[PDB]
Amino acid sequence: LFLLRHSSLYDSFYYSNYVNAKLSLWNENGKKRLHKMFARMGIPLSTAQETWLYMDHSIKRELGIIFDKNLDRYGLQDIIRDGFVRTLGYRGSISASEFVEALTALLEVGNSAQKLTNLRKRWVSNFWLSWDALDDRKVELLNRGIQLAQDLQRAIFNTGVAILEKKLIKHLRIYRLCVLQDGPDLDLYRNPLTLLRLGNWLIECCAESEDKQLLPMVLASIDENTDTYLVAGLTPRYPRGLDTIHTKKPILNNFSMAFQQITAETDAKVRIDNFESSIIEIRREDLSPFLEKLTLSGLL
Amino acid sequence: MYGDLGNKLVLEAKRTKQLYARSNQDVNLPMYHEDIIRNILKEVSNLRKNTEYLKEQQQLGMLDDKVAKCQYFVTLLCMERNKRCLLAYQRLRTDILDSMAWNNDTNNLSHQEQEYLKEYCDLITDLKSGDLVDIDLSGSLVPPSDVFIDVRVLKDAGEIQTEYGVFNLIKDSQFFVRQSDVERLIQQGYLQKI
Amino acid sequence: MSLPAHLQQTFSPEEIQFIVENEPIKIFPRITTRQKTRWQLITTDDKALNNMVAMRSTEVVLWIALLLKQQSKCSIVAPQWLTTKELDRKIQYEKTHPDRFSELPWNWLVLARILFNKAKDDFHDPIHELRGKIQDLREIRQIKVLKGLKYLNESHLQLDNLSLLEINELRPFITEIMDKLREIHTASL
Amino acid sequence: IYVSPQQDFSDLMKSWKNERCSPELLPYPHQLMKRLLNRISMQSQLIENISMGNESKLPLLCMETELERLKFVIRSYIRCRLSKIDKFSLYLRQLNEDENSLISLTDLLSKDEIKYHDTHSLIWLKLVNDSILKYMPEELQAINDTEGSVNMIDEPDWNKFVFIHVNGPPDPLLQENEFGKPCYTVTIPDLKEEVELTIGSIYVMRYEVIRDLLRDDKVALI
Amino acid sequence: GYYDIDDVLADGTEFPCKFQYDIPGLGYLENNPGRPITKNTKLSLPLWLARILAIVGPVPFVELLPPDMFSTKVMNAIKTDPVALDLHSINSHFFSLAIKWIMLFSEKELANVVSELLLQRAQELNHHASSLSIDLNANIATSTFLLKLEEMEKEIYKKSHESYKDTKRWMFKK
Amino acid sequence: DDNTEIIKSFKNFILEFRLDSQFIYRDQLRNNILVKNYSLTVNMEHLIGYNEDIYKKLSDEPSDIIPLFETAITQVAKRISILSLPTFQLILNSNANQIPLRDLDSEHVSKIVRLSGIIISTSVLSSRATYLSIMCRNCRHTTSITINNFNSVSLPRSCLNCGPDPYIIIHESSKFIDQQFLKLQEIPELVPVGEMPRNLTMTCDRYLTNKVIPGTRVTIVGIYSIYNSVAIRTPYIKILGIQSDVTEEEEEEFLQLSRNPKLYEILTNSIAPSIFGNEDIKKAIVCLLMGGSKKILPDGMRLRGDINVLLLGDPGTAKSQLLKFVEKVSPIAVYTSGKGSSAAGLTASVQRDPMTREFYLEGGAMVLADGGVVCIDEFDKMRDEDRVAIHEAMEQQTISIAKAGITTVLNSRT
């Protein structure tokens, strides 16, 4: 769940990759199913939306039993897991996943060639902003990171809802394409980490579950301020929490070699400089030709 | 009467002192108040003219001893008050200038004050070059502490070659160095103790 | 001027810490300096440092003890006064007499903070108990100081066994008020 | 009288504290500062020699930290002395010129301090003459007048209050009091009062009454 | 001292005076040039002139009438309740002027009142200076009393507050 | 038994809590005691962190638990301040989910809730009782009863012969505390379409009085209780904490802003950024916003310092938009339509208090605009009598309506 100990239970079940993938909350029927689940579990709706700290302590104590009793029915039996929790005296607890999410949020949204340099240097500064937060004397940075993580998750959820509702994910025998060209949150999708967050969100929902074949997904986002696409080549994933022989074998990501070959053949000023080869930057006028070349490559 | 301009100048000096006290190093002296000083000096010249007239009248004319004494004493007292006010203003400005010189635009300084600043910097260089050469007099009065600290650069710069070594001050790059080596760089504002 | 404004006619807490660290303390060395290079400090004795054996208690300056603890090469010996039992005894002594001050060491506030920060696992008593007892002692001392400030005059004042930090706290106010009263009295004569 | 380096450092600390808390400019301990500067120079040379050549890392670190601490103490003492000279500039000149008083700047300051005093006095006199004094009549151009409405020479405050700790001898002035304890006796002339200072205690006394004791080192300012 | 802004300003206040001589040419002192000053005439003069005129004369040139800030009303107000009295309105340099007055006239009755007032006000001054703030999440009386502080009291309060704040910051620094 | 245990728990919480190195609440209590401020502000987050059972008990039955918290605070204060004081007051800060004002219902009776709204009216300080001395009419038996504001007291009916209600209060040996009544209106945004704003009465005591004025957005933490006025009860709120949306750093920022060499031009630009042209009107409105320095003469003739402006042009000129922006920008402003209101709306009108039936004076727009700016629109449609009333009001800035049973006057510096 997403920031269970720093938000409301309803929000924890709402802004979650696995929960949404299992229940497909992006449509109204998913929200109705979630409401029915909460009603069956016995937790009221007003109580479920109260912050974790101020929520009634009885339900907080009995939560594990409630989850065990009433989650098999809705298929969310893989939600339960064992994780590390670190708490300092008289201060609220925090789990490893929440700490990592806060650190990533601080890295992402915390705070011609000139714009590129400014963006990269802002990311470098955010690196140090995150570095300090990793200490026990800088709890304020941790709280700010948690708030920023909440905001980023809300924005990514909204964008994913829009994409899924409008059915922008075209399907091809080899790969799947999702190109963004408008929206209110397109500014955020310039940091590779945020774009990868959106990619993971989309991969979990209907690309790894819902009886769908596993194909690499190419996700791109425009930025009119520089006229280029932050194309990212993501790898598929097997259903979460399903141990099997095929699950043991890692799913290799073949985007790097095909990307390099296509860049070598053509000339579109592709910026292959990120350490992760999955991400490049292609000019606006040369996106569709590059996609056609990738389709013809047959190397994915 | 005669001390109004002096009192106004003293009020301005008080305001300057309060401003200097409020901040630490951003303090910049206000524009050297020249008009009021010139008015006060015109007042002093007028008082000198009156004194000369009184002397002439006493030597040539009718002027009883008591009246002459009263007038002379009053004039002398006004001149003394003006002298005190101007001297206090100048002394305060000199104190601020000395503070600035020891710690380390000029349009706010009278040419005499600019010469004063130059000479005082020369003097500071003079004392430090004598027998007190082992101790850097123009140092930091914060007592020593943990020998090794982490300093983060706050301003992009080149491979500045200081006496202690070559530090590539790439913006947003942390160092782990002895506090002594990066004391002056911290003072100049390139680094941050965090 | 040559000296800042706040450093005139008084001290700063950093300088008080500097003064406090110039005192000796006992430590448990973890290495064997004694022979079967070597220290030649000039301000402090260097014989003790050159002759130290592991686990055998020795005396060195507090500043050097902290430097050794930074590398984890010694274990500081908490003074006898810091222990809990002594703190309860001193609290009872303070409570019994509402006029006189206890007889704690002059450096009982700086040393407490330095040891609580740098050496948090060398004590033989719980840390929170020590912090609470020190807070109670400080509060009672503050009450007594407040009560005693009503007897300022133009002749003199006596504050037996008052720590250096509290004297530094009160130096400006007491000195200035007494100076003004003395000036008024002198003018009266 | 040389005893040991640690004794010299203790004397340096005592002088620094006295100067910081004192209301007047105390005499300069020439020999102590000469010895300390020579020792600092020789120790720095020895440190350089040792560093020219991981068990020895910590000894050298302690060397450097100790040198930094000693340098800080000396620098603070010198700066305090310079500021005190700055404030009481005209008074020092009057004292030096005055033949009756046995005090002499050569017996109260070092060579660097006397150079600073002379140069600062000259510069300030030039500035005031250029700005203000040259326009005044012959009766009001003296920068040091002692017959006007307000004295132009600011003298040290002879009754400033200071915190004193009665250390005692390292003495006819010592008379054991009624409560089984040795104690000094002082007299306040303005109030016609007699005060008794018992060893191992902290007082808030006037400077003039205890100045002789401070000179003799019986008591030390906090 | 000579170079002290607060000392210079205090001497600039206006004290009542009564000329008991008949001097000509001193017209500008009263309100107009070129008019002889009659005798037994009251006028307001700055202290730096009134003091010298009173001291220097057999018969002083001026006779300082009882000021308005040392009247029986102010003495009774000071004796009644020192803390709530607003000294700032009475005079921004009350203590310096008071000390100068006692020195000039060596009156042993005002000294006791001034000393008691200063002590009582200093009690509350220290009470307010030692009360700092805490940012637990991460003054009205203080402001009300702070506005009633003389210049000397304001300086003492600022110094004491700075000392207390520095000590607290050092003590609770992480 | 249980009460003593709860008191000890609260005492231990206060005396033991510490985040990094500083005892927050101990030092806060000491500082508050030093300046004669008898109160303690506690963040509920810290209380939950220290021990969840204490917060559980506090939230369960606040009316019963809070007084014990005050007793513990008073005991700790006496321990900390007096070497071996009135009952202190507890102020609470919380970050729980806000409950809309319109959604309050019987489910939240006698529970701590957090809401928000806009204050529309405030009363004058009352005098509640905290320690009453009582003497019997017949046998003259002296007794004392202590009272706490929270309800889940009345004079004894049986003497401790003497008939019913035999006790009378000795007012020369009793103690009282301040009380105030406020009215809270739901935020305009949350009002559903076609419905009307609902109001809620609130009560505050001791150091929470005189903390707000009408027209200020506030956030309230308090107890939703009911007081008897078929078998219905009137809801109301007992305030425990006020946090209204209303130093040196801002002084430095403002001083730096004033140092800009084109301050006049930027200020004239900020005046109505959305309206083109009319630069002279923009500068005049800036001058009106800043105003003129006050003048007072010892004789009695004090000149006016405020500035008034007249905009007289044909329709479609954005005069109303300028007036709206002036109203919004100024810290204190009243936007009034001349025809919409009347003589009562502006200046002042003499009315009668219904509850007490006494003639009183109620101020108009100008009175409510004292110390600010009043933007009157459609000067033409306003009636001539109201125009002459405004003439007098601006002439003297003191609406002189002192007759008809009363002789009170009000200031209208606007």
Ligand SMILES: Nc1ncnc2c1ncn2[C@@H]1O[C@H](COP(=O)(O)OP(=O)(O)OP(=O)(O)O)[C@@H](O)[C@H]1O
């Ligand atoms: N320069 C301008 N920029 C923008 N709007 C303007 C401008 N000049 C006039 N307006 C118009 O002003 C309108 C709002 O002001 P309005 O016309 O009601 O003022 P008014 O002339 O006092 O009205 P009326 O005279 O009809 O009572 C807007 O609809 C608008 O577009």
Ligand SMILES: [Mg+2]
């Ligand atoms: Mg209109």
Ligand SMILES: [Zn+2]
């Ligand atoms: Zn009865």
